[PDB]
Design an enzyme around this catalytic site. Sequence first.
Site, mmCIF file in Angstrom:
data_model
loop_
_atom_site.group_PDB
_atom_site.id
_atom_site.type_symbol
_atom_site.label_atom_id
_atom_site.label_comp_id
_atom_site.label_asym_id
_atom_site.label_seq_id
_atom_site.Cartn_x
_atom_site.Cartn_y
_atom_site.Cartn_z
ATOM 1 N N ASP A 1 59.462 -33.902 48.612
ATOM 2 C CA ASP A 1 60.252 -34.297 47.451
ATOM 3 C C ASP A 1 61.676 -33.837 47.745
ATOM 4 O OD1 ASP A 1 59.987 -33.863 43.795
ATOM 5 O OD2 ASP A 1 61.072 -35.298 45.050
ATOM 6 N N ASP B 1 50.127 -38.223 43.764
ATOM 7 C CA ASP B 1 50.196 -36.814 44.129
ATOM 8 C C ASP B 1 50.184 -36.008 42.836
ATOM 9 O OD1 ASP B 1 53.386 -37.079 43.519
ATOM 10 O OD2 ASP B 1 52.761 -34.981 43.515
ATOM 11 N N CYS C 1 28.703 -36.427 44.934
ATOM 12 C CA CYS C 1 29.744 -35.994 45.856
ATOM 13 C C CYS C 1 29.221 -35.665 47.249
ATOM 14 C CB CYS C 1 30.477 -34.782 45.279
ATOM 15 S SG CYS C 1 31.841 -34.234 46.315
ATOM 16 N N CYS D 1 31.055 -34.044 49.575
ATOM 17 C CA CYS D 1 31.790 -32.937 50.190
ATOM 18 C C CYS D 1 30.889 -31.784 50.634
ATOM 19 C CB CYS D 1 32.890 -32.420 49.251
ATOM 20 S SG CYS D 1 32.409 -31.095 48.115
ATOM 21 N N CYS E 1 29.430 -29.399 47.862
ATOM 22 C CA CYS E 1 28.282 -29.908 47.120
ATOM 23 C C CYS E 1 27.012 -29.971 47.954
ATOM 24 C CB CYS E 1 28.607 -31.280 46.538
ATOM 25 S SG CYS E 1 29.803 -31.163 45.193
ATOM 26 N N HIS F 1 36.270 -29.161 46.933
ATOM 27 C CA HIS F 1 35.519 -30.169 46.200
ATOM 28 C C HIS F 1 36.437 -31.114 45.434
ATOM 29 C CE1 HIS F 1 32.976 -32.252 43.402
ATOM 30 N NE2 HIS F 1 33.788 -31.835 42.448
#
EC number: 2.4.2.29
Lengths: 364, 364
Positions: B92, B265, B300, B302, B305, B331
Site C-alpha cells: 500500500d 485483502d 475444510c 487445511c 482441520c 485455518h
Amino acid sequence: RPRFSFSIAAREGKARTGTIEMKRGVIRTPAFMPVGTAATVKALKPETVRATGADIILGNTYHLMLRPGAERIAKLGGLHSFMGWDRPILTDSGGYQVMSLTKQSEEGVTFKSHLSRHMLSPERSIEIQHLLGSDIVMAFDECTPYPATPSRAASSMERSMRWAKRSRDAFDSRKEQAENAALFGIQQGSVFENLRQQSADALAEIGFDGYAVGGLAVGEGQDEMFRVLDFSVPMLPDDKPHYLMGVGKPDDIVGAVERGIDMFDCVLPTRNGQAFTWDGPINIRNARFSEDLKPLDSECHCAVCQKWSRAYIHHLIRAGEILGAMLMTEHNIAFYQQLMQKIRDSISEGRFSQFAQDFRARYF
Amino acid sequence: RPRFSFSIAAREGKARTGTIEMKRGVIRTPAFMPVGTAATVKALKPETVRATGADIILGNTYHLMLRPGAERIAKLGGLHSFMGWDRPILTDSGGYQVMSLTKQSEEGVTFKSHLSRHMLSPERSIEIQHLLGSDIVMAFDECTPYPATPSRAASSMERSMRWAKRSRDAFDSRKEQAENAALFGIQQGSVFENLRQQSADALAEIGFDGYAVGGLAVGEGQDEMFRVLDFSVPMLPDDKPHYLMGVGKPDDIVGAVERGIDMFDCVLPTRNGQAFTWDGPINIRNARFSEDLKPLDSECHCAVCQKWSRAYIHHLIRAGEILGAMLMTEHNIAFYQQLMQKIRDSISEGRFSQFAQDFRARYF
Ligand SMILES: NCc1cc(CSc2ccccc2)c2nc(N)[nH]c(=O)c2c1
Ligand SMILES: NCc1cc(CSc2ccccc2)c2nc(N)[nH]c(=O)c2c1
Ligand SMILES: [Zn+2]
Ligand SMILES: [Zn+2]
C-alpha cells in the site's frame, strides 16, 4: 516394542549412549526433551518438534491438571491425541511446580490455582499422569528448598522416599498403566552426600525403571551442581536411565553427561531473544544484528538457519511478532538436538572427552 | 513472464476469473491477498502462507517505513529476500495508514511515529515501495473520512487524482521500477456517483495497470458498500484488475465479485478466537467447544482441520498459547483461499450466481 527397555550401546568414562525402547517409540540417549507447558511445545507444531530431532517431549502436569484438566483430557482421548504428538511423553508429578507457582502434609499438598482449591497426593499425581496417558511417569516428590539445612534436607528426602513407595504402589495397582508406561523414582538429599546415598538406596530397594537426580538446578551454581553429581550419579543403578531434572544450559548438559546423566529437559530453549550458537549464546535483540545477513549459527542445519537472517529475526523479536518466537524456538530446540547428536556420536566413537574439550573452548 | 499481463478467461454477469502474470509469479483472480503487518503474515512461515493457496501477499508499508525502515530493507536485499517470500507482493502507499495510526498539505503528510517526525509524499511513497521491492505499487492517495460531505469528498478526491498523476510520473521516472513492477491507481469519491465517475475518468486518462476502489469499508455497512460498488466498478477500465481495498468478510467478497471485483485483502483472517466455517463464523473461545472433537470446519482441507480438534484449539486460545494463533490463522487463510478457489471454479463453469446463492444460504 516392549513397555520399557534401556540398552547401553557404548561408554566412555561415566558417559553412556544407548536407547530406551517404549511402545510409542525409541528414545536415543543422552536425550534432550523439549518442554510443553500447556499441552504444547511453545510456538511449535508437533511435526516441527519432531523435525528438530526430539524423540520425546515433557508434559507439564501442573498446568494441565488445572487447564484443561486431567479428566477432560482423558475424555478427549489422552494428551497424545489431544496435542498431536504420537511419540513418548514424560510427565512430571506436579508437586514441585505447585511449590513454586500451599498446605503441605504427609498426605500431600493442598493449593490454590494461580490462574480454586486443589489437593495433590502421591496417589492423585499418578492417577493424573495416567489420565493424561503419560509414557514415563515421575514419582510424586517434595520440593527441597536451597539452601537447605541437613535436618530439613533429611526430613524432605525421607518424606520423598515414603512418597516414592506410595507412587510405586499406586502405579502398580493400575493394570493399564503398569503394563504400558514406565515409572521413574527421584533422588533427593540436597547437596549432602550421605542423604543422596540414603535416597539412592531407598529408591533402588523399591525398584524403578529409571532414576532422576532431583533437587538440583535450584540456584546452586554449576560448580556445586557438578560436585553433587560427581558422587550422586554413581549411587544410582547403572543399568537404568539417569535423568537430571530441569537442567539444560549447553555447558551444563555436556558436563552432566560426563558424569553419567542420560536425560535432560529445560524451558531454556523455548521472546527473550537468546539464540544458542557453537560460539556461545547471542541475544538477537542487540542492535549489532540489525543488518547481519548471516544465519543465527554458521553451522546449524535447522530450517531457520537455512532460510532467514539474524537481521530478519532481530526485526521480528523487537517488533514482538509471533513468527519471531516461532523461528527462535525452532532454532534453539534444533541446536539442542544437534548437540545431543554430537554427544551421542562422540561417545559411540570414544572421543567424547575430546568433544567436550573442543565444545567448551569454542563455546566460551 | 511479462512485467504485467491480466487476462480474463471466463465471465458471468459482472464477475470475472483469470490471471495476472508477473515476473515473480502468476496470480489467480479473483484473488485474496493475506496481509503481512511487519514483514510477516501474522504467525505463519511464508511456506505455510503459500501452502494455503495464496499467490500474492500484501506488505504493510506504513509499519515497514518506520521499522526496520525502507532504506535498511533495501540494503538487506529487499522485502522478498528479507521475509523469505519470492512471489508477488503488493504494497500500500502508506498514506491511508498514517491517517489512522499529522499535518496534511498538497505536498503530502507529516506525522509522528506511533511507536519521531516523518514526511510522506507521492514521490516518497513510490520510492519507499521501490526500496521494498514491491511488485504491485499503489498510488499515494488521501484518506476520505466517512461520512463525508460532498464538498469534502470532492476536495479529497481531486487531491488524490493530482497525487495519482504524481505517483505515475514518479513510478515512470525510475527505470528499474517501471520495467519490473506494476502501478495501480485508486478511485475515490466517497459514496457519491458523480465523484466516483470523475475519479474513474481521471484515473483512466492517466493510465494504470490496475484500478482499486478505495474509500470503502470505512463503516458504511455492506448494503451501502454494495450500492456504491454497483455504479463504481463499471466506471473502471474493464480490461484491467479491480481491487477492493480492505474488504475481506466472506459474504462481502462474494458480493463484491458479483459486482466485478478481482482482488481482495484484509486483516480479518489473521487471538480473537473467530474461525470461519461454511456454516458461518464461530468463536472458538466459547465454552461449548471445550470438548468438541470435530475440526474447525467439517469440509475444510487445511492441515489444521486434518490434525487438531476444536477442543484443542479452544484450550490453546484460552490459554494464550502461540500455537493457538498459528493454527487459527492457518485455518482462516486456508478457508479464504478455498473460498476464492470455489469462486474461480464456479465462474469458469458459469454457475457462480448459483454458488453465491448456496453459499449465502448455508453461511447464514
Ligand atoms: N529446579 C530443577 C528441578 C526441576 C523439576 C521440574 S522438571 C519438569 C516439570 C514439568 C515440565 C518440565 C520439566 C523438578 N521436578 C521434580 N519433581 N523434582 C525435582 O527435584 C525437580 C528439580
Ligand atoms: N478502509 C478500507 C481501506 C483500506 C486501505 C488499506 S489496504 C492495506 C494497506 C496496508 C496493508 C494491507 C492492506 C486503503 N488504502 C488506501 N490507500 N486507500 C483506501 O481508500 C483504503 C481503504
Ligand atoms: Zn539454526
Ligand atoms: Zn481448516
